[PDB]
């Protein structure tokens, strides 16, 4: 955990995030939806629950990205919920929720669900 | 359960379904997305798990509606997952998943999530 989480992570589709896990449960960094460009870059913030593990459990964590920066304002936010598992092939497995700001007529269609796995390679 | 489930159910927004709970776990009927019109009417099918209850548990169930009939073909299907609770104020509390058929580029945005409660009144 902590030192294990700190670094660069990649998913299947070309997205990258960079995170520092801080001593008292903090997670901070940047999500880049495409590894090339300097603003597909958005702020991330989250938390993780550190614990003594004796049985090969994952570490529960979560983070939020709001989709606004100097180039784009998509009127939406995503949360990822999941766990870190370390080792030779460390991964973070997540499920996510994306909500867009709607009028109240459209509120029932505001939230998408999906899943993502991140690796160090 | 069974006799308890059989009948007409209403949600907050004006939708209605009519269901028969059959002796060996079957659920069949029609969902009408608006109580007025004779085809906002679509076929439903599902299952429920009947059990001896001694502690005031709900009955787990689920059903599917594909959104095609003689008037509309929306290229989508919804599944509702939840439980029936009986009594003076019997309700069915659900969460749902709506998936639309997409091209593979659009597959990550294919599924919405939400929730519904149904009552007899």
């Amino acid at each position: 955990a902590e030192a294990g989480i700190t670094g660069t992570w990649y998913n299947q589709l070309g997205s990258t995030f960079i995170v520092t896990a801080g001593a008292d449960g903090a997670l901070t960094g940047t999500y880049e939806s495409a590894v090339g460009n300097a603003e597909s870059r958005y702020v991330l913030t989250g938390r993780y629950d550190s614990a003594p593990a004796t049985d090969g459990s994952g570490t529960a964590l979560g983070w939020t990205v709001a989709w606004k920066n100097n180039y784009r304002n998509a009127h939406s936010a995503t949360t990822w919920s999941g766990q870190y598992v370390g080792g030779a092939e460390a991964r973070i497995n997540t499920q996510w929720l994306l909500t867009s700001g709607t009028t109240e007529a459209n509120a029932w269609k505001s939230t998408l669900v999906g899943h993502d796995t991140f690796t160090k390679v | 359960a069974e006799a308890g489930i059989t009948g007409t159910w209403y949600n907050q927004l004006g939708s209605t379904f009519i269901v028969t709970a059959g002796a060996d776990g079957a659920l069949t009927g029609t969902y009408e997305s608006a109580v007025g019109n004779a085809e906002s009417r679509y076929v439903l099918t599902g299952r429920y798990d009947s059990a001896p209850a001694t502690d005031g548990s709900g009955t787990a169930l689920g059903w599917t509606v594909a959104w095609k009939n003689n008037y509309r073909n929306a290229h989508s299907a919804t599944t509702w997952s939840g439980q029936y609770v009986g009594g003076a104020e019997a309700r069915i509390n659900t969460q749902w998943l709506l998936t639309s058929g997409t091209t593979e580029a659009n597959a990550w945005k294919s599924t919405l999530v939400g929730h519904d409660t149904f009552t007899k009144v």
Binding site: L13, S33, S40, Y42, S76, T78 | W108, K109
Partner: peptide
């Protein structure tokens, strides 16, 4: 072309 993937 949402922010998340593009």
């Amino acid at each position: 072309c949402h922010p998340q993937f593009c």
